[PDB]
Design a protein around this ligand. Structure first.
Ligand SMILES: Nc1ncnc2c1ncn2[C@@H]1O[C@H](COP(=O)(O)O)[C@@H](O)[C@H]1O
Length: 133
């Protein structure tokens, strides 16, 4: 439950399973900037430039995507996964990340990317801190 120091997240990825027309590029860039600042201020800095940011659709897209990521980006520390409401994509991200490829993933809801609040960003930093701590 305690906050872990020493975490720096330099290589990370975004997979957006929410529809681009709903969660546009500027939503992603804005969400990301807000996340960079609060994680910085908290002392678990996530660098502002993700190594990869793409839209995907459907649970079947998850495993080919993570394979690509794992095959392409050495030192990949985290995949942030944006979800549009209740979706089987969540189950699949966890199956593949935790069980198949050993890749750390953190899911977040589309609504919290379209409009951030300090508290929802805080919730996310803590979930991330526990994971990589
Ligand atoms: N069945 C589901 N469908 C969509 N989103 C989910 C589901 N289960 C959990 N989540 C979201 O996943 C996030 C937690 O992800 P994680 O901490 O990576 O396990 C929470 O913010 C939830 O909103």
């Amino acid at each position: 439950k305690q906050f872990h120091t020493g975490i720096e997240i330099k290589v990370w990825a975004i997979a957006c399973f929410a529809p681009q027309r709903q969660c546009t590029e500027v939503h992603l860039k804005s969400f990301t900037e807000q996340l960079r600042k609060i994680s910085r201020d908290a002392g678990m800095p996530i660098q502002g430039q993700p190594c990869f940011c793409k839209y995907a659709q459907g649970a079947d897209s998850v495993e080919p995507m993570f394979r690509h990521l794992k095959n392409t980006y050495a030192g990949l520390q985290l995949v942030v996964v944006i979800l549009p409401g209740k979706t089987p994509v969540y189950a699949e991200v966890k199956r593949v990340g935790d069980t198949v490829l050993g890749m750390a993933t953190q899911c977040v809801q589309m609504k919290n990317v379209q409009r951030t609040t300090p508290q929802t960003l805080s919730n996310l930093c803590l979930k991330i801190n526990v994971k990589l701590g």
